[PDB]
Scaffold this active site. Structure first.
Site, PDB file in Angstrom:
ATOM      1  N   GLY A 193      -3.343 -19.553 -25.761  1.00 50.68           N
ATOM      2  CA  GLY A 193      -2.334 -19.246 -24.752  1.00 50.68           C
ATOM      3  C   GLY A 193      -2.098 -17.774 -24.423  1.00 50.68           C
ATOM      4  O   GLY A 193      -3.006 -16.930 -24.493  1.00 50.68           O
ATOM      5  N   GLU A 216      -7.483 -22.496 -20.586  1.00 47.64           N
ATOM      6  CA  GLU A 216      -6.836 -22.698 -19.382  1.00 47.64           C
ATOM      7  C   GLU A 216      -6.147 -21.468 -18.844  1.00 47.64           C
ATOM      8  O   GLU A 216      -5.895 -21.461 -17.694  1.00 47.64           O
ATOM      9  CB  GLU A 216      -5.989 -23.943 -19.334  1.00 47.64           C
ATOM     10  CG  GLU A 216      -4.824 -24.035 -20.296  1.00 47.64           C
ATOM     11  CD  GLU A 216      -3.920 -25.229 -19.904  1.00 47.64           C
ATOM     12  OE1 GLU A 216      -3.159 -25.056 -18.877  1.00 47.64           O
ATOM     13  OE2 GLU A 216      -3.984 -26.315 -20.612  1.00 47.64           O
TER      14      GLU A 216
END
Length: 387
Positions: A193, A216
């Site tokens: 993250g 992501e």
């Protein structure tokens, strides 16, 4: 000449709100730092004309006017495997009529880039019969499957305006970072993250070589290591030599670094987050951070768990601080306020716990060992009443 089309489809935000937003339309906004706030601003000014407009989105950075109470009756917002959002459009779960996105200036062939947001935003652009794109002279140009031609744009709102920025270790957090790094090998293509923990992790990895990226999302931390020579995906077995995500945000430095840079590429999530694609990357190691966990192993976050568990030599780590509210509260509990056959390691400032291959009883206590010390006898007490 496509610029003759460029010319024929340019309007103001307001003219585009009004013509594109028929009563009862549903709209989707591209997200995160590519959120089309000019268009939100124009929906505010034009409120007295909009009727039943539904908007769908997720992260917006700056976008005030929609939850402005005075939007009531003009436009309302609607809403956990991140990779399935795109299917809401590609399947009509959310019958999007207009996609409002923020791209960059088109290139010599009339192709613009989604810039810092591919994620669900490009799938939406593909599934909407009317696409409103704010053309931003400041939006960086980034490649991969991140382009959209000028001819697919219905209304273009040329603007110029700096891409919202979010600037991103700490004591505890750093030790967390350090413990993760003992799981991570030179050559591993990571997923992390954004936040203390991630920036800690990358701090701990400054003695590593050949790392690769497939997340992501990412921030300034990634730049930094690409910069120091550590992130290079030379070992990547998927998109070798480039850092792949689905979105990016951070400081103006980030934005200027990613602009027009071969070695950075975007792709949508219905791909990047697909455990199958994730899987093709070897030594894939995902690092996520949950909010609480139990004596048993139970907490895009999940996409990467699954997909880490398919690459050859991959693992998945849940790293988080052993407490909350200044140590009043244990993030490790018997009983939680997504079952165990999920995660392989768990890391806290107090150390590591191996889960792949553990009994109900080991998982229990190997965890308790990395809990905060206050909580360990309450915790150890619980195991006993279970044996």
């Amino acid at each position: 000449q496509w610029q003759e089309l460029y010319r024929q489809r340019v309007c103001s935000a307001d003219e585009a709100v009004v013509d594109s937003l028929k009563p009862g339309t549903k709209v989707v906004f591209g997200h995160a730092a590519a959120a089309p706030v000019r268009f939100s601003q124009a929906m505010y000014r034009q409120r007295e004309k909009l009727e039943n407009i539904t908007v769908f989105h997720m992260l917006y950075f700056g976008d005030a006017p929609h939850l402005a109470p005075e939007m009531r009756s003009h436009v309302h917002p609607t809403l956990c495997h991140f990779h399935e959002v795109p299917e809401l459009f590609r399947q009509g779960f959310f019958p999007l009529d207009v996609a409002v996105v923020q791209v960059s200036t088109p290139n010599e062939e009339g192709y613009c880039s989604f810039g810092v947001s591919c994620d669900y935003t490009k799938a939406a652009a593909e599934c909407a019969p009317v696409v409103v794109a704010e053309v931003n002279k400041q939006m960086p140009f980034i490649g991969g499957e991140n382009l959209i031609h000028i001819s697919k744009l219905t209304h273009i709102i040329e603007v110029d305006e700096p891409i919202a920025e979010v600037l991103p270790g700490s004591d505890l957090e750093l030790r967390i970072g350090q413990n993760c790094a003992s799981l991570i090998k030179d050559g591993d293509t990571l997923q992390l993250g954004i936040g203390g923990i991630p920036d800690a992790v990358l701090r701990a990895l400054e003695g590593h070589k050949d790392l690769g990226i497939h997340t992501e999302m990412f921030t300034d931390g990634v730049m930094r290591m690409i910069r120091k020579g550590i992130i290079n995906g030379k070992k990547k077995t998927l998109h070798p030599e480039k850092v792949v995500t689905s979105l990016i945000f951070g400081s103006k430095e980030l934005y200027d670094f990613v602009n027009n840079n071969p070695v950075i590429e975007c792709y949508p999530v219905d791909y990047i987050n697909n455990p199958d694609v994730i899987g093709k990357n070897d030594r894939m190691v995902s690092i996520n951070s949950c909010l609480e966990m139990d004596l048993m192993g139970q907490a895009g976050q999940v996409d990467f768990l699954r997909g880490a568990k398919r690459s050859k030599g991959g693992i998945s780590i849940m790293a988080f601080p052993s407490t909350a509210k200044k140590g009043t509260e244990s993030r490790i509990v018997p009983i939680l306020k997504t079952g165990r056959n999920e995660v392989d390691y768990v890391v806290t400032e107090y150390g590591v716990a191996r889960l792949r291959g553990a009994t109900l009883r080991q998982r229990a206590e190997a965890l308790t060992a990395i809990a905060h010390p206050d909580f360990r006898p309450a915790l150890e007490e619980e195991i006993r009443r279970r044996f």
